[PDB]
Design an enzyme around this catalytic site. Structure first.
Site, mmCIF file in Angstrom:
data_model
loop_
_atom_site.group_PDB
_atom_site.id
_atom_site.type_symbol
_atom_site.label_atom_id
_atom_site.label_comp_id
_atom_site.label_asym_id
_atom_site.label_seq_id
_atom_site.Cartn_x
_atom_site.Cartn_y
_atom_site.Cartn_z
ATOM 1 N N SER B 226 0.855 -1.483 -0.064
ATOM 2 C CA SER B 226 -0.002 -0.074 0.023
ATOM 3 C C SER B 226 0.952 1.196 -0.031
ATOM 4 O O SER B 226 1.848 1.264 0.659
ATOM 5 C CB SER B 226 -1.097 0.179 1.096
ATOM 6 N N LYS B 227 0.352 2.272 -0.516
ATOM 7 C CA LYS B 227 0.950 3.603 -0.548
ATOM 8 C C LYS B 227 1.286 4.210 0.813
ATOM 9 O O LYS B 227 2.133 4.943 0.878
ATOM 10 C CB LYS B 227 0.061 4.644 -1.422
ATOM 11 N N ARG B 228 0.811 3.694 1.695
ATOM 12 C CA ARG B 228 1.147 3.963 3.076
ATOM 13 C C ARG B 228 2.505 3.661 3.285
ATOM 14 O O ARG B 228 3.401 4.487 3.595
ATOM 15 C CB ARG B 228 0.018 3.313 4.018
#
Lengths: 453, 461
Positions: B226-228
């Site tokens: 995830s971009k997280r």
């Protein structure tokens, strides 16, 4: 990177010659890792779909075109806006082309234009000297400039000529090689000169020798049928015909054709289209596959619910048992029909008149774009009316031509079901059996054809 | 005979590492077997699709070294390769499913009379697929073998939307068939809905392609990528100065079995040598690999790559006007302009203590600005400015109250060249990355804060 094209006009059945030229352009683009382009220079959308269907049936395909799209479109002239007038204006602005109503004065010219008088734009073409066309097969061909006819760029209706548009579009689509029939070679100097007026990189040119009948005469529907779809309806395999187009050019598949294709292996004499050799090859293709592959092709060709259910109603009313169906309906599967001249002795039409009617009907049905019962009837009725005969006078001639018998299922229905190709084919064979038409009768009867709706 | 594989990316924003990964596998499987690899653009969502996002897809995949045989940008004998150019093909096939009783008109029940009546009155409706309720479906996965999904699990399925567009689900079945796709490699995210795919092919009476569902890329903590945790956009790795050969190689090492070319990757490609657990995306491993690629080449190849990446007239002349008015001599340029070349910036929390904004408010502003800038498709100065002002206006703040937070986030300093100009030049990925790290340093956002602020975000222009 190599780019080739075909630019068919959407004006009727695609023919074998078009398939032939398409094949060469395809293999040449494929051989060199390039693209093959289909461009429609338009005319009806229906005739366009006929072109796509017939060539795909054959096994030919293209990388860019009006149906598959592409990043160098649009691929129909009618979708490419005012791009042609633009380039034609420039040729005029640079004095390479002139307005024609020839004369010259920019006074009277501006005036006549202002009043909206009809005009065309002509290309200026050198009047003296020789032109060298660098043909890929023949080498340098010398064509003298004097014999070069005049050339219209923009027509009276503000549409480009086929000539203009194809030079413009080949440029805009980045076509590197133009392979075309040698019918186009005479006008090649006008093409070359046009690329010069524009300052554009001129593509490589190749003019293919014409297909010929075995009597060394040009291919024509008269001597042998030319439409792709006729061979489909006769039950030829598209691989056989495609194979045959290749063997004429330079037993194999298209993939194998591409592998071992090279332009240098092409004859400078016109290849002969020999129906007997084609039939033998097709027979070989039919034999050299599983019975299951054979069955599927036969189902696709005609033994399928769509074709049979079209026949069923017309048959259901005319048999007393099922074993009487084949003799009655066999003509829907036989290609031609067995011919008997005695079936054509009309009550009140003499033999010349019978030939006259058949010829006129054949001509109108050859022109008929939409193959539907009412339209087929309208044609025959118009011919009859114009001859002050009735429809019932002519119909008895249609039955044995189309079905091989004096009476049968409704022959108008039969013709729609059989389709255009087989119908014209059978009519032409009846006409030939009865003696055809002399050169003089053809001239007389064509005047009549022209006065017929 | 003749293998044909594809990817069907939706033209909605940056292409990500996952797309790259699924592309590489489909490309390798096709090449291994002498076949073709197709790129198909499914602009099924015409309202969130753009010609520029498509172009970003082509640019990013080609940068990475991925190529395709047929696609919208190159053409192909089975085009068009954009869904929006394929006409009423889909209505035609959806009409057959209703006429053959496998799909129904939904506006509830269905009387032949009341249905015709509503349709004739132009009432809004969809076409839905009939999906079995009892029993299970067996999914013939090339890697895991037979997988059994219960039909009870299948939620209903729309074939044609009320706006007369097909769902992505119906379109891809129709287009895989018409393009003669033989093998379908997709992410395992699609495995749950696989039974509906199988049923749909049965309904048309079509030959079902071979199916293979790939395990998900994961963060080093076994969390789905995830971009997280990790930056997922391809262009981010380009702007950070990774070599596309290294990223491509890394995508291949994760997939099957550390320095190999694409050409070499294809030769040694075996679908069977693929792990059934989630391959781990590890930034530090990718970085070590990228270093080896940088090292094992001529100084001249290295130099050209650095020129293309950032040391070129185009990039340096965007910077020049902003630097010219701010130095008394040329050796003051590097400290001032270094942040144009550094990727992240050095972070100092004390740079974010606002005059009139408390620590929680600073985080909310940065979060809202980041969200809006993540949504921005056209990375241009006036549009970046508009986003931040709309955030500021909506918080009843002035633009000049928010700008002091942007300077240190973007440049690492309190003041600098014009930060809005700097953001345009830096580009979307680096800007977003820098803002996200500034936010993380300050403490990020709780789950509760995220729910509340998202409500605020959705009310902002």
């Amino acid at each position: 990177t190599v780019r080739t094209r075909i630019a068919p006009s959407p004006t009727g059945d695609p023919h074998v010659g078009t398939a032939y030229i398409a094949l060469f352009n395809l293999c040449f683009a494929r051989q060199h890792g390039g693209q093959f382009i289909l461009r429609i220079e338009d005319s009806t959308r229906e005739s366009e779909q006929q072109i796509y269907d017939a060539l795909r049936w054959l096994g030919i395909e293209w990388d860019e075109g009006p149906d598959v799209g592409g990043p160098h479109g649009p691929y129909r002239q009618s979708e490419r806006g005012h791009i042609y007038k633009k380039y034609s204006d420039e040729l005029v602005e640079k004095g390479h082309a002139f307005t024609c109503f020839m004369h010259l004065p920019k006074d009277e010219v501006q005036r006549r234009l202002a009043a909206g008088e009809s005009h065309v734009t002509r290309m200026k073409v050198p009047t003296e000297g020789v032109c060298v066309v660098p043909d890929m097969l023949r080498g340098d061909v010398e064509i003298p400039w004097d014999r070069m006819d005049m050339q219209v760029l923009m027509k009276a209706d503000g549409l480009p000529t086929y000539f203009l548009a194809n030079v413009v579009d080949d440029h805009l689509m980045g076509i590197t090689h133009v392979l075309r029939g040698e019918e186009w070679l005479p006008s090649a100097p006008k093409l070359i000169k046009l690329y010069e007026y524009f300052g554009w990189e001129q593509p490589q040119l190749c003019y293919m020798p014409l297909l010929r009948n075995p009597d060394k005469s040009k291919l024509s529907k008269r001597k042998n049928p030319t439409s792709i779809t006729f061979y489909e309806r006769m039950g030829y395999l598209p691989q056989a015909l495609l194979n045959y187009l290749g063997r004429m050019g330079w037993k194999f598949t298209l993939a194998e054709m591409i592998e071992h294709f090279d332009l240098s292996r092409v004859s400078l004499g016109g290849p002969i289209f020999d129906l007997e050799k084609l039939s033998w090859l097709n027979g070989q293709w039919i034999r050299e596959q599983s019975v299951e592959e054979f069955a599927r092709e036969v189902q696709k060709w005609a033994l399928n619910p769509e074709y049979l259910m079209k026949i069923a109603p017309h048959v259901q009313g005319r048999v007393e048992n099922f074993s009487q169906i084949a003799p009655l309906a066999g003509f829907f599967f036989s290609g031609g029909v067995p011919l008997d001249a005695s079936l054509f002795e009309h009550k009140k039409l003499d033999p010349t008149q019978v030939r006259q009617v058949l010829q006129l009907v054949l001509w109108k049905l050859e022109s008929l774009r939409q193959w539907e019962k009412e339209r087929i009837t309208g044609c025959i009725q118009a011919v009859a009316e114009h001859l002050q005969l009735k429809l019932r006078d002519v119909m008895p001639l249609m039955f044995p031509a189309i079905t091989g018998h004096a009476s049968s299922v409704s022959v108008l229905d039969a013709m729609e079901i059989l389709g255009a190709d087989l119908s014209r084919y059978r009519l032409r064979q009846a006409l030939e059996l009865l003696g055809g038409a002399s050169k003089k009768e053809t001239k007389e009867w064509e005047k009549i054809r022209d006065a017929i709706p």
